[PDB]
Motif scaffolding. Sequence first.
Motif, short mmCIF file in Angstrom:
data_model
loop_
_atom_site.label_atom_id
_atom_site.label_comp_id
_atom_site.label_asym_id
_atom_site.label_seq_id
_atom_site.Cartn_x
_atom_site.Cartn_y
_atom_site.Cartn_z
N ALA A 173 -20.19 2.42 14.50
CA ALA A 173 -21.00 3.45 13.85
C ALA A 173 -22.44 3.46 14.37
N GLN A 174 -23.01 2.28 14.63
CA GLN A 174 -24.36 2.19 15.17
C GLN A 174 -24.45 2.73 16.59
N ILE A 216 -19.00 -1.63 12.18
CA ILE A 216 -20.43 -1.38 11.99
C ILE A 216 -21.12 -1.11 13.33
N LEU A 217 -20.80 -1.89 14.37
CA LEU A 217 -21.35 -1.64 15.70
C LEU A 217 -20.83 -0.35 16.31
N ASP A 268 -22.44 4.99 17.80
CA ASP A 268 -22.31 6.44 17.67
C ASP A 268 -23.64 7.09 17.31
#
Lengths: 720, 372
Positions: A461-462, A458-459, A464
Amino acid sequence: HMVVEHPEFLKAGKEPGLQIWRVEKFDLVPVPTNLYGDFFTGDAYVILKTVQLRNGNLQYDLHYWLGNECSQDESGAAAIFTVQLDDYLNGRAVQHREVQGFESATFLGYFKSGLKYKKGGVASGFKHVVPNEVVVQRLFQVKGRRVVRATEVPVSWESFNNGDCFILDLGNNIHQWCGSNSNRYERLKATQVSKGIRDNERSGRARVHVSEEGTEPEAMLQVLGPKPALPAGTEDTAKEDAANRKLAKLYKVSNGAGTMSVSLVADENPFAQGALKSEDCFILDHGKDGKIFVWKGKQANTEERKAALKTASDFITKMDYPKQTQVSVLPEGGETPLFKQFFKNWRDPDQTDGLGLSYLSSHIANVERVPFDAATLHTSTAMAAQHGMDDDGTGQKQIWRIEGSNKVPVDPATYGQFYGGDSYIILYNYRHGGRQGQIIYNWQGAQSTQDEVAASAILTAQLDEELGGTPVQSRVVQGKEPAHLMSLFGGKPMIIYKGGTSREGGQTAPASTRLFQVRANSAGATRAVEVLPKAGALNSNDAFVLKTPSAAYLWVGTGASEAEKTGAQELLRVLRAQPVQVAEGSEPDGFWEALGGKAAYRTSPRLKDKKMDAHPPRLFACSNKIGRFVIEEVPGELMQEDLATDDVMLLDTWDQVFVWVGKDSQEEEKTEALTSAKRYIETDPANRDRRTPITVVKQGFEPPSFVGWFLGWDDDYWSV
Amino acid sequence: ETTALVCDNGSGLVKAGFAGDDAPRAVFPSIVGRPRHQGVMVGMGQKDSYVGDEAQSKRGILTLKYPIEHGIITNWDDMEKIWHHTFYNELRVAPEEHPTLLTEAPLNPKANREKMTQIMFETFNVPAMYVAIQAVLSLYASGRTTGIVLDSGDGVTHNVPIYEGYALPHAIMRLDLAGRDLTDYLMKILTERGYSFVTTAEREIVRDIKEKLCYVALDFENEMATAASSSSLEKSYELPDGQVITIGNERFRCPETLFQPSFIGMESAGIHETTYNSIMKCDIDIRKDLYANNVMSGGTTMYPGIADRMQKEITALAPSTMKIKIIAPPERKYSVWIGGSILASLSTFQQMWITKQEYDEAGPSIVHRKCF
Ligand SMILES: Nc1ncnc2c1ncn2[C@@H]1O[C@H](COP(=O)(O)OP(=O)(O)O)[C@@H](O)[C@H]1O
Ligand SMILES: [Ca+2]
Ligand SMILES: [Ca+2]
Ligand SMILES: [Ca+2]
Ligand SMILES: [Ca+2]
Ligand SMILES: [Ca+2]
Ligand SMILES: [Ca+2]
Ligand SMILES: [Ca+2]
Ligand SMILES: [Ca+2]
Ligand SMILES: [Ca+2]
């Protein structure tokens, strides 16, 4: 550029002058000479001027002139005749479009007196049709007991009775009216004839309505009028079956005897469908209500067809049929269903026999049982490698570690020092001149739990998305790193510790006695993982590092490459210790009491051997869970998760091919994997010994020769 | 300091709990039970409606209604009863000081999305809320960011390809065939052996039979020939009135509606063709890792042999150079809740929360702009 040989084109463009043509019903007529320079407003014209030059050649110029009242066919014919007259010429002419009232000034220049227009013109060659138009208003009485037939009756309420059934045909709407005293068979015939009129005469562009007494729709009451009292109906006897039997006369027309021949096939219906021979022309004469059908075969001559049409027209005046009799011309496979009712069991060619079968529009796999050939394994070793990671990996990078629910930066003195039970994000910047670019790696340890790896994803993707989406991601797990990721630390080994952070325990304290195993591949990328310090965990191919709180030991086996020794001494400088350079076979007693053991570590003569960079050991997965037996490669180096419990595994080490089976592996997997391993041995391109032994290895009972090829063996991995 | 709530409201089950935990605290079926008989004994404890496990324990005298039918919400008063039960009776917490994360299937009608907002700020008065796609939470729970998710629960079955953490809207496919349809098909085909099940309580019993005694055959025709030739595949089940029924080939015919939808009369293709056409509508370079990262989620992917059958069917359809990996974690029944629980507990998440202030200056349209 195919030329045309229209006979009026032969006088075009032979002498210098000016020529005019008019379009009359898809043809050109040249207008006479004293009608030059003036035009009809509802016609189309083709204008030619040819001009002699000084050098001897003869140029051409086409115009096509359209009035404001000409139809589509005249203007289209003028355009196509302009194109075809250019193609009759050798493409040397230029074409112009001229509109009435908006002519070019050069077009005004050709005519001396000027342009003057009259009304009118020749009529168009088109005849008016509307797409999908039917104007039909008919009424049929179907009647009978065994031989049920349809007869056309005039459209009135007085033609109705209560004992038959009726079909009122109004084009796009067909109304089926069933009498109260009507029986089963004429109801079935009414349904069959109504569906035939819908699906064959109108090709499905109709709707069939079924009605009875008291439920007449507004359409029937609008066409027929208000409803009187019906005059009951006679009981269905056998005399009108004989009357229906005598209604049609099937005749033959054929020149097969060498002469004209009109002969009677039958006068008794139901006819036979096989009586309609395909080489002749047949006539059905249901001329009491005015129908004569001319059925043409596919293999009938043209004079047979014209003779059949002539004979059908001759049947009008001989037997004194009324003056509305329709001669319907029917080819094979295009029969009217009023023609079909006189035949016993008419068979369309694509009919359904019995209940039939569904098509289902979607199919499951039905792959054929092929034996698999093992020679495709070591051959055709295709590989894609990297696409944009051309740099050697100095760069400028940032490494974050996920603790709990947040990432923190790691210490900048500790780049290549990861924890096995944690998750990391590595942002990397290209200094390379290939349009710069950024890489985000998501590293996941094997001992890391679900919360850490989910938070890392999740981090990732965030991170990115908050850099604008320009970097590309690469999920990586422990043991499966690319070559570019190992080069990020600049010749340093990847140090993997044991343990890590957690939400409830925090950072784990390191052990007093620590043991480290160093591996290096053929390229040079090198790992150093922490293993549990027993004497049986030593691998003779490897370089080991022992850190005790008294001293340190650097143990070197006979198969250790120089990269393994440099990585080992780099790890010694990481751990801040001074080793004493222990070699294999000359160990001191202090080393053995530091391990707390004596002997029995992992030893095979293949692991003794120095030469292993030229011949890597290759691991293979054997399964039949898709039904077909397949062997596949596994990329990367060897750990526990590559070994599948439900599948059979092969390890090729160039001198002994290990076969490894799980707890729940099938026995035919085992046997045909033995045969596949044998065929893999004979088919290798470099010739090896044909008696290379096949050794069967069970799960949980593995020899150290098998175990020593794996980085970081765990004895209690599979045991819960 | 306030703990956020994660409430995955599926079509058949409700999975609710606190953010940061590893397992959901309350799992209970989303049904509303109402009495259908005449109450003759006075006093006692007769209520007008029963919700959840209390309706399951008394289902012999109740008619049972599902608020959610094929993903969409039909009854909203019953759904408010479900939300009141999962806040006040199951989690036993006051919802006016906890932000609440909700989940939603993709390609849903838009009118649900503000309506789910329209209860949450007006009746329960939550401080913040967020709506997330179930498939991206399932992919996050596996530790992945790029891959294709086959999410199949009780109402719908959808294939979602996700690249760089964002679902591709032009390749998401929906198939209205899930566990309730398989339960109804099993009720249809148990009449062949003489067993009649028409009551909603009997529908619950047949759902239990489907959970205990069903599996996916690796090949259908050979398994049918094996079931015809002998009786080695027959199993017995005990009904709650002590009656023992025996089922044979119906063990594997009921999962085969997933791969052959024409059994219940649907023209649409199976789940493997749906996955293949979902992959085929993506860009050419990213098809390599979509075949290699094929995760499965939901309770309907819990049959034995579903992953081997899926790999067999995808392998026959894909090119032979491709590598196929069907990924079936053992926790895939609750993977949506695990992804929501990790995603809500992050310290970087407290600016995507749709709080009260922007809602009541913006109306019920803020959910269409902040929740992508
Ligand atoms: N072991 C099992 N085998 C087959 N089906 C199952 C099993 N466990 C649950 N199911 C099915 O999964 C469905 C619910 O799945 P899930 O996605 O967890 O809930 P929801 O669909 O409400 O989100 C139920 O309809 C049930 O029939
Ligand atoms: Ca004209
Ligand atoms: Ca030309
Ligand atoms: Ca009659
Ligand atoms: Ca002939
Ligand atoms: Ca950890
Ligand atoms: Ca990106
Ligand atoms: Ca080595
Ligand atoms: Ca197997
Ligand atoms: Ca669900």
